[PDB]
Amino acid sequence: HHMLKLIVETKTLVQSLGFASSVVEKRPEYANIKLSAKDGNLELSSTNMDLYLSQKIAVQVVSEGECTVSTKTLNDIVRKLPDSELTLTDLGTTGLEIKGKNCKFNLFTLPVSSFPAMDSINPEASFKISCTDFAKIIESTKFSISLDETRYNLNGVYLHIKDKEFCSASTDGHRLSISWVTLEKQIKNFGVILPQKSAEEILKIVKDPKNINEDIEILLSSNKIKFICNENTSMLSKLIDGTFPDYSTFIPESSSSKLVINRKMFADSIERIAIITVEKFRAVKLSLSRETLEISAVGEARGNAKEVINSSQDKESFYEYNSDESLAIGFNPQYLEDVLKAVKSDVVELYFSDVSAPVLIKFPENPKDIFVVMPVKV
């Protein structure tokens, strides 16, 4: 025989089915999930052309076996069941039975022999870091991935190890984001480009309350990357077949003036002033002096706006600009807002050169997160 039968905590299964359905999203009715009951666990397997997600959860395994059902149908049903635990039973011609105290659902099954097993990985480099560290690195870099699909090598995060630093960098031609953590063990240099969708899904997995305070193992090879998050969840991802640019050449080697400013005050003021702008001209102007900053904007046939920030040594309203010269320089407000929201920091530093040269953005208490943003003509 060997027919699946198990009892599972409902909330845990809901959590798993959430990850199973979001991973196989692509520009949903066709996706199947493999359920495998064995050795005190349920393994849920989801996959497409680009990623394979395997999740193991502890269950009461009553009878070992496997089956596959529609991911969406199983997700929708389990989310509406009120019992704290559910019974799942493959009933053959009757389908997969999902049973609570008062209700039974029967799902059509598909033959398990038609469901691919996970590929393996021959890692050139492997290491473990905390989930909090991995989350920070992706959180600081996902937002500046290119969405221009004709630039294949920029549609992901460049995950790489350089001299015991594990780093994510991303760029879209207009901004660059770099975030890293130092590793404990000697490890070979290596780099791969993780596609955006893979980055978004593993970030969501690492942020689960059951995982965020633990560790994730990461294994890199030339043709795939594998994550094992907190032992029980593994994700194998294809890589983007391309070459990430030497991004170090984007980082200003020197600057002529420096702004230190309260981050929330800065971010809130940029956002507020940006409202008046129009799609054709997404720009705010920073008019910087030692005594004041005015953030201004114009929107054709809409209006104009200006905010004044005065110099202050108070932390809540901090503003310091170390130059006798004035500087008027424009930026896309979205690109500044994205950096300012990526790091929870009291103040932020901006290092300027020429009006046409990129700004370097650093957070003084967060020294392993660095950002570069091109200006726009204003």
């Binding site: 760029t171 031609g173 207009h174 640019p245 050449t249 984007f250 091109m374 003509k377």
Partner: peptide, 10 residues
């Protein structure tokens, strides 16, 4: 709207 010094691409 100038780009970072990507070579090529800008």
């Amino acid at each position: 709207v100038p780009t970072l010094p990507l070579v090529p691409x800008g």
